[PDB]
Amino acid sequence: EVGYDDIGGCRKQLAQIKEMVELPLRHPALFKAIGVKPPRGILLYGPPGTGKTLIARAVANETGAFFFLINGPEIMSKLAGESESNLRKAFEEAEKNAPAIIFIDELDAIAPKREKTHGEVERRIVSQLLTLMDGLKQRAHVIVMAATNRPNSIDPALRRFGRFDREVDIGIPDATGRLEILQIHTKNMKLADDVDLEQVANETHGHVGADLAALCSEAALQAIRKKMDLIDLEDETIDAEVMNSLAVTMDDFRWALSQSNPSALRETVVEVPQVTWEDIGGLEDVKRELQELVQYPVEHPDKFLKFGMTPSKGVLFYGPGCGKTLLAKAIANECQANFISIKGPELLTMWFGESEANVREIFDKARQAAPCVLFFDELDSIAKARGGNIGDGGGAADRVINQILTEMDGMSTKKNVFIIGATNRPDIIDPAILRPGRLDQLIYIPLPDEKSRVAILKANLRKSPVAKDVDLEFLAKMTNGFSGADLTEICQRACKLAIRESIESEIRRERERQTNPSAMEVEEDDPVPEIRRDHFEEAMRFARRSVSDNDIRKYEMFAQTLQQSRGFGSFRFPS
């Protein structure tokens, strides 16, 4: 049957559910001699196709509890006045086979009322379901798990104490989980040796477990269409050996990925960033300060408690393409905490639409995925949108920033969410953002140094084949004030020049065989196998400094606008 092996994604909420349900189910007799209330209901919510029903079935099988599935529309499709009988009989049957697990798939259909509550019979169904759910006499060990797309879609009374008192957001699987899902979905098709499922997994961003299964099936169907159809040898049952002779090639998977259309790309991603400190070449003072502020409270919470100091839970990066987003990702990676990034377009959308309640939802999501690093990238976007030199007649306060401040003030309770803010215009940022209890720790990210520039060039060119002849230290030193974005542009232009030269050359060489068919075929391989000095020289010919020295001067002004006075530098105690 289905078990933990079938449950893919390694998303680490299956472990939480296990810790939740073993003792109530794995050790049911224990609770008989101990006075404790187990989890009467667990609400699994997330994007559709994430395997919530699969997870519930696997838990039921691995714990031995009698699994009962109450399909939402199955009862809803039944005639009014007798569907209530179906729900009551389902609970009674689950009660009989104690311990039992009752799974309500698509719970947002039985009790969708969000206090709007249209209709008459559906109100009866929701109220009776409430009576049954609250009617659990704590006898036996029936655990009611329900599936829902979002927590707010179901009736709020279902979310109350004793009905569904604890919720788990399965969420979209990540690259590691996408790879494991691909492995589980590719185990009987005799996958080819060339295909590794790693490149596909990385390119598979935005898919869900159902999406991964559909992509694998589409690749298999492409393989079946490409071969074994030309022969057209078919019978009632295709020969096992004949079908096994085919191997799903990388090309088939690539085409399937091109024909994927993932079912929820837009959904926000809660993922541990893969970026590491290696990608950033320097910022040692900044790196150490970030390590302090974030890592120290958790690695050594006892020492923070000993001195009675509460660590700051907000940091605001200010600077000119210098790597603030990358720095935030790296700091999140070092602590192995989930990273949530709120770019400027999202804030601008909330501001234009006059919908700031999304800030509440974003903060709740960050709270659920703890430990997390809630990063508000380019937080000054709203101020720029309203102006910056003259702007609106009013002050710096705006709806979105006010909601963010309210959530931060109401935050800190969680002890895990850490707010990081990045802004290229510190002058226009609202001052309230920098007050204590908010993003008070201001960190300045300067233009990368020569060593930092070398590291940035190496990180950008790690994947590309770069000839050892081209000296990278010389190029980094040559770039007196290039930003990280400028270095990335130079590397991309060099790669583009190399690609164009290689394409043009092999194209001509192919004319050369077509025009003059050679008697003996002897390919000399690639005329340009790796990026050379001339490519980099031509690319650097177009190198440009995006960041002018005047805006760096303004940042230096603000930095010295956070000046530690000029009279205490020699402070000595009287002794």
Partner 1 sequence: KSRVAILKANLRKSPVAKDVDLEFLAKMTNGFSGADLTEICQRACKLAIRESIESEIRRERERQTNPSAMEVEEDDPVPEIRRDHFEEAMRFARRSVSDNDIRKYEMFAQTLQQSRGFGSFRFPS
Partner 2 sequence: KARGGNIGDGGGAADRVINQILTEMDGMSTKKNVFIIGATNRPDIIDPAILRPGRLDQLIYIPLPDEKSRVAILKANLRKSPVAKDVDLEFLAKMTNGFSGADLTEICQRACKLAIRESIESEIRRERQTQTNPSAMEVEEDDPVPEIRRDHFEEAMRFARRSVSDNDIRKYEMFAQTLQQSRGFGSFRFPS
Ligand X SMILES: Nc1ncnc2c1ncn2[C@@H]1O[C@H](COP(=O)(O)OP(=O)(O)O)[C@@H](O)[C@H]1O
Ligand Y SMILES: Cc1cc(OCc2nnc(SC3CCCC3)n2-c2cccnc2)ccc1-c1ccc(S(C)(=O)=O)cc1
Measured distance between the N- and C-terminal CA atoms of the chain, rounded to whole angstroms: 78
Residue 561 sits in the site that holds partner 2 (CB under 8 A): no
72 binds ligand X (CB under 6 A): no
User: How far apart are CB 371 and ligand Y at their closest, in Å?
Assistant: 3
Task: Please identify which residue in 159, 415, 532, 554 interacts with ligand Y, judged by CB under 6 A.
Answer: 415
Strand, coil or helix: 530: coil
- DSSP code, position 151: G
3 state SS for 425-484: CHHHCCHHHHCCCCCCEEEECCCCCHHHHHHHHHHHCCCCCECCCCCHHHHHHHCCCCCH
Query: What is the distance between the alpha carbons of residues 39 and 20, in angstroms, rounded to a whole number?
Result: 7
Using CA atoms, how far apart are residues 295 and 487, in angstroms rounded to an integer?
30
x/- track of binding to ligand X for residues 203-232 (CB under 6 A) = ------xx--x-------------------
d(CA 251, CA 253): 5
Query: Judged by CB under 6 A, how many residues of this single chain contact ligand Y?
Result: 18
Q: Is 546 in the site for partner 1 (CB under 8 A)?
A: no
Annotated binding residues, written as ranges, equal 48-54, 149, 185, 321-326
Compute the distance between CA of residue 393 and CA of residue 528 in angstroms, rounded to an integer.
60
Q: How far is the CB of 264 from ligand X (least distance, A)?
A: 11
Query: What is the DSSP secondary structure assignment for residue 311, as one 8-state letter?
Result: P
CB 542, min distance to partner 1, A? 16
- The residue from 98, 305, 503, 557 that contacts ligand Y (CB under 6 A) is 305
Please choose which of ligand X, partner 1, ligand Y, none residue 184 contacts, taking the beta carbon within 5 to 8 angstroms, the exact cut-off set by kind. ligand X
Nearest to 9 by CA among 179, 239, 251: 179
> Interface residues for ligand X in 9-68 (CB under 6 A)?
9, 48-54
CB of 541 to partner 2, least distance (A): 6
Q: Contact with ligand X (CB under 6 A): which of 76, 184, 189, 246?
A: 184
> What token pair was written down for 471?
């000296």
Burial of 376 (0-12, 13-18, 19+ CB in 10 A): buried
Please, what sign has the CA dihedral across residues 290, 291, 292, 297?
A: positive
Of 159, 205, 367, 554, the one binding partner 2 (CB under 8 A) is 205
| Residues 470-489 interacting with partner 1 (rule: CB under 8 A) | 480
Distance, in Å, from the CA atom of 338 to the CA atom of 421, rounded to the nearest integer, reads 16
- Which of 262, 297, 321, 426 touches ligand Y (CB under 6 A)? 297
Q: Using CA atoms, how far apart are residues 329 and 337, in angstroms rounded to an integer? A: 10
Q: φ and ψ at 43, to 5 degrees? A: -105, 105
Per-residue mark of binding to partner 2, 315-344 (x: CB under 8 A): ----------------------------xx
With binding defined as CB under 8 A, does residue 346 bind partner 2?
A: yes
Q: Which of 67, 318, 418, 444 binds ligand Y (CB under 6 A)?
A: 418
Where does this chain bind ligand Y (CB under 6 A)?
294, 297-298, 301, 304-305, 308, 310-311, 313, 335, 337, 371, 373, 415-416, 418, 463
Where does this chain bind ligand X (CB under 6 A)?
6-9, 48-54, 105, 147, 181, 184, 209-210, 213
Where does this chain bind partner 2 (CB under 8 A)?
205-206, 257-258, 261-262, 265-266, 343-346, 348-349, 352, 381, 384-388, 390-393, 470-471, 474-475, 478, 485, 488-489, 533, 536-537, 540-545
